[PDB]
């Protein structure tokens, strides 16, 4: 949720359009978004099209225009010279697809390959006029949409919902990484910042639920503290637990402690469950679900929530606001838990 | 005071003070903060979801014994309906399901005399995997249908020489409730489901009587105070269409803002008498005063 929040582009705000005033010509997906803003991920409600997410490989140049990397082909030879282009440069040239038959020497197997022309038109061009190629598939999709396996077999309407619902999952007490993923989990977990990464290589000295002590190769020792049962902005848990032993040797950049929704450094938002695809007595009727009682007995889907309450003492003109056990009109049975000072 | 509909252990108390020269907003002498923690399990009505937009609340939670179980006695953990898959065009989940099983049991492609054709382009180190293996299919470059079919055709037995899921990906289940086997094979696998933050414990609310607003004497709103469910303008047309006049009158007079009707109806109910007749809502008198405050001489004749 946080990682996706930081990579968000909102068209509405001070100096921008309004949610109840924008037409359907600004909510559409322009053919110049390829590689610069994900076409799937977007709100489902009345904000649809006004809020989007930056793509994985995109960057912003000094003038504020988003760029994408393209691998330039010279005389039909697919080089490794990555050049960052903006919308206009991409418009001038002809760009091929990443998933094309490269023949181990940077040469397409067949001459006819799908390309994108000036106005975003798609055509078949002989493999001699191509100027550039995408650095990879998975270039047009964002971080959230890059974690849906078998995305090309899902319709856009359902992929949008699946991407928007991965950032509502609650962290569970015990986490489990998926059996079938997409390899984006590790990078997203590490760049989200919810794990502890060994800043410098060394050997572990002490490990406990509260801290980790690392003895660097040159004298210095560093102690990492852990966030235990800390509340987040939305009232969930923010546990951290070490995943290293007292003798293991760590290396710079290595994950040294898990986070809320990570399993050994990889994002783990849910659990792997054994599922059948049958209709059963009408209890799973019209989008409902049936669960086993095991998932309750074994605390498979149990979670921890934390609530915060505040109160303060203020002077006031009359003066002297006090926090004390002496409360008028209150009996003693209702003052049993309160300690000596409130 | 801990507000309505909350509980749990007190895990943390953070108390500030002006005595210890702590930095507080001007005019504040002390600041106390209390944390209350709850451990919630999954229950009927909690919202679940997969990675392919297949959401849905939990309809039922069956005991372990009366659930469809495989030939070796393993109950299934979740049951999903067939009619939602083909219509919404998210067949991807099924593929995941299939691959999940191949990741769970593990497989071994038999390259005894040449690798099979379908595994010609399958990267080596995938020709055999141990049980509970973890694999990855990048978003737009992954496992083909031919490769999934091949992997399903070759998969390891569980403990004895039994293969529970056939080449089609479907297994024979037993009806855990009546005991008879189901007539046809069913599609079983492993799917990665998440728990969304739309729990019932925050949604349920009820009220008989409670706080009332100040300017207009209608009940408050929201679970934190108590509040009543709005009976809007669109719900009044349905009652008029039904022809139910008395229900609408009681809803709009002695349940919302008839200041004396409320107490009289409560007394009549507790004493077993007949419910009295409604009076005049207070918001109408508020409206008359607001109109008079605009220099409009609104008067009610007879």
């Amino acid at each position: 949720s946080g990682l996706t929040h930081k990579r968000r582009l909102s068209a509405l705000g001070p100096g921008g359009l309004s949610r109840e005033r924008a037409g359907l010509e600004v909510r559409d997906v322009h053919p110049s978004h390829y590689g610069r803003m994900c076409p799937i991920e977007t709100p489902e409600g009345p904000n649809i099209g006004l809020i989007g997410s930056l793509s994985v490989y995109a960057r912003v140049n000094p003038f504020g225009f988003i760029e994408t990397p393209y691998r330039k082909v010279v005389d039909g030879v697919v080089s490794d010279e990555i050049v960052y282009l903006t919308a206009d440069e991409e418009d001038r040239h002809v760009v091929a697809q990443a998933n094309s038959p490269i023949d181990a020497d940077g040469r397409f197997v067949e001459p006819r390959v799908l390309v994108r022309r000036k106005a975003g038109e798609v055509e078949y061009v002989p493999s001699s006029e191509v100027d550039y190629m995408d650095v990879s598939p998975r270039q047009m999709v964002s971080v959230a949409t890059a974690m849906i396996p078998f995305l090309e077999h899902d319709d856009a309407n359902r992929a949008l919902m699946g991407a928007n619902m991965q950032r509502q999952a609650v962290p569970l007490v015990r986490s489990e990484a998926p059996l079938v993923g997409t390899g984006m989990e590790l990078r997203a977990a590490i760049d989200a910042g919810d794990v502890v990464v060994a800043e410098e290589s060394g050997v572990i000295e002490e490990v406990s639920a509260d801290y980790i002590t690392v003895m660097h190769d040159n004298g210095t020792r560093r102690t990492y503290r852990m966030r235990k049962f800390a509340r987040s902005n939305h009232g969930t848990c923010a546990n951290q637990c070490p995943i290293v032993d007292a003798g293991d040797r760590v290396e710079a950049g290595q994950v040294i402690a898990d986070g809320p929704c990570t399993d050994d450094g990889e994002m783990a938002l849910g659990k792997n469950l054994l599922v059948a695809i049958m209709p059963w007595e009408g209890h799973n009727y019209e989008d409902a679900i049936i669960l086993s009682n095991r998932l309750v007995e074994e605390d498979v889907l149990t979670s921890i929530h934390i609530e915060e309450h505040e109160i303060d003492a203020r002077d006031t003109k009359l003066g002297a606001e006090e926090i004390t056990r002496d409360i008028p009109n209150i009996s003693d049975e209702v003052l049993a838990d309160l300690d000596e000072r409130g | 005071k801990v507000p309505h509909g909350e509980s749990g252990k007190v895990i943390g108390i953070r108390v500030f003070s002006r005595e210890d020269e702590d930095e507080l907003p001007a005019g504040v002498n002390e600041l106390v903060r209390v944390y209350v923690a709850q451990k919630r399990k999954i229950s009927d009505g909690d919202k679940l979801a997969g990675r392919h937009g297949n959401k849905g609340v939990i309809g039922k939670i069956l005991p372990v014994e009366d659930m469809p179980f495989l030939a070796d006695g393993t109950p299934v953990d979740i049951i999903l309906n067939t009619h939602g898959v083909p219509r919404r065009m998210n067949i991807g989940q099924i593929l995941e399901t299939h691959l999940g099983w191949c990741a769970h049991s593990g497989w071994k492609v038999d390259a005894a005399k040449g690798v099979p054709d379908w595994a010609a382009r399958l990267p080596d180190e995938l020709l055999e995997a141990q049980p509970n293996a973890i694999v990855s299919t990048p978003v737009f470059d992954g496992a083909q249908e031919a490769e999934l079919q091949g992997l399903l055709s070759c998969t390891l037995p569980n403990r004895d020489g039994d293969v529970l899921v056939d080449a089609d990906g479907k297994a024979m289940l037993f009806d855990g409730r009546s005991g008879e086997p189901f007539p046809y094979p069913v599609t079983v696998g492993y799917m990665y489901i998440m728990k969304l933050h739309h729990l019932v414990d925050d949604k349920i609310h009820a009220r008989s009587t409670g706080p009332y607003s100040m300017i207009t004497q209608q009940p408050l709103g929201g679970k934190a105070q108590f509040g009543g469910q709005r009976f809007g303008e669109m719900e009044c047309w349905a009652m008029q269409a039904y022809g139910a006049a008395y229900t609408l009158q009681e809803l709009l007079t002695i349940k919302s803002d008839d200041t004396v009707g409320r107490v009289k109806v409560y007394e009549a109910i507790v004493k077993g008498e007949n419910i009295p007749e409604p009076g005049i809502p207070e918001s109408f008198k508020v409206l008359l005063k607001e109109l008079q405050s605009l220099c409009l001489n609104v008067e009610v004749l007879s």
Partner: peptide
Amino acid sequence: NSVPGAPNRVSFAKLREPLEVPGLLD
């Protein structure tokens, strides 16, 4: 693949990626 300590998660990918994903918070 580049992180020092990471789980071994085998991939079905066929193509090779010339460019590694940048810093997601850059």
